[PDB]
């Protein structure tokens, strides 16, 4: 997300980029178990 985020700061207004990485960092939930995705892209996102 750090490298990806800077590479996005190249393309777009850093507000949009920080929104992108901020959306790629969330709490992923399945049945009765929860974690956060710090590392790796979340594909289900639209801008993914």
């Amino acid at each position: 997300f750090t490298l990806l985020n800077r590479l996005l700061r190249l393309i777009v207004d850093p507000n949009i980029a920080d929104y992108i990485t901020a959306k790629n960092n969330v709490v992923i939930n399945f049945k009765d178990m929860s974690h956060v995705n710090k590392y790796g892209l979340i594909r289900g996102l639209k801008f993914a």
């Binding site: 997300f1 750090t2 490298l3 985020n5 800077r6 700061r9 190249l10 850093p14 507000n15 920080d18 990485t21 901020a22 960092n25 969330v26 709490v27 929860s34 974690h35 956060v36 710090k38």
Partner: protein, 308 residues
């Protein structure tokens, strides 16, 4: 001579703290570092007449905060347009000043290792984004003036020495918090209590701070490029979040223990502010610590299974 040196020193912090940044006043500025060393020697080995000295720190240390912040704003005012992303990427004035001295050291791999060793507070990712800014922004052209280089070197010196003074006060208060705020000491810890009282200045002032704002004390500046969300979901982080009182319990309860903990810390510091220095009782923070233990164990224990 402490009572002779100190009031004039505080007066100086008022003078330059009143002086707006981007207006250098370098000759008047360099007169602080002799008083910085003076307060360092007055603080370090004296260990005498603390009770008179405590209100004096409660006075000077906010001026120290506004002063180092002023040196930061003036220093970025100097580096403006050469490498502008450096404040956004580097939150702290200490990391800022040191890392800058490193970018101006000029004396590759020894640089990547060198700012990691000299700065020492820089996390891997922070080094990464900093290196990104080095490529996309940092001009790697010689500075506009060698006199400007000497000026920014001086600002690095006064900011570094001033921060060393603040940390020295943090260690001295860190020594005396046992008699200063016993309730907060017993409730959290000597180091973290010393960091809270250190950032908030006077214990009276830290009692004047609501319990909602205490959690964010000490938090590294929120940066949009840095990741935030944690499995505990706590957005405050900060000093108290690093305490054992929180970190001993599981990942789900850190948030509630943070809110309740900050509340009980505010109340405890208020009791310590209300009590005289001579007669103090830790019983209140004791039963409050028991209450927080009960809260953490109840929130940790899940509900019993229902009949299907």
């Amino acid at each position: 001579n402490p009572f002779e040196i100190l009031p004039e020193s505080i007066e100086l912090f008022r003078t330059l703290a009143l002086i707006s940044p981007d207006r250098l006043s370098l000759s008047e500025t360099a007169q602080i570092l002799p008083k910085i060393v003076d307060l360092k020697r007055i603080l370090q080995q004296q260990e005498i007449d603390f009770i008179k000295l405590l209100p004096f720190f409660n006075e000077i240390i906010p001026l120290i905060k506004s002063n180092i912040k002023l040196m930061h704003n003036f220093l970025i005012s100097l580096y403006s347009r050469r490498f502008p992303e450096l404040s956004s990427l580097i939150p702290s004035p200490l990391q800022y000043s040191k890392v800058i001295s490193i970018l101006e050291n000029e004396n590759e791999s020894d640089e990547l290792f060198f700012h990691l060793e000299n700065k020492a507070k820089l996390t891997r990712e922070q080094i990464l984004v900093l290196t990104m800014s080095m490529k996309t922004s940092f001009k790697n052209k010689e500075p506009l003036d060698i006199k400007t280089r000497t000026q920014i070197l001086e600002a690095n010196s006064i900011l570094e020495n001033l921060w060393k003074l603040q940390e020295d006060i943090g260690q001295y208060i860190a020594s005396k918090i046992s008699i200063i705020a016993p309730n907060v000491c017993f409730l959290v810890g000597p180091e973290i209590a010393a960091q809270l009282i250190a950032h908030a200045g006077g214990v009276l002032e830290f009692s004047r701070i609501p319990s909602c704002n205490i959690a964010s004390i000490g938090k590294n500046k929120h940066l949009s490029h840095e990741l935030h969300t944690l499995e505990s979901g706590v957005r405050q982080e900060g000093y108290l979040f690093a305490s054992d009182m929180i970190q001993k319990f599981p990942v789900s309860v850190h948030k509630q223990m943070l809110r309740m903990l900050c509340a009980k810390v505010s109340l405890a510091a208020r009791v310590d502010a209300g009590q005289k220095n001579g007669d103090r009782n830790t019983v209140l923070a004791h039963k409050w610590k028991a209450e927080l233990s009960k809260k953490a164990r109840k929130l940790s224990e899940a509900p019993s299974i229902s009949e299907t």
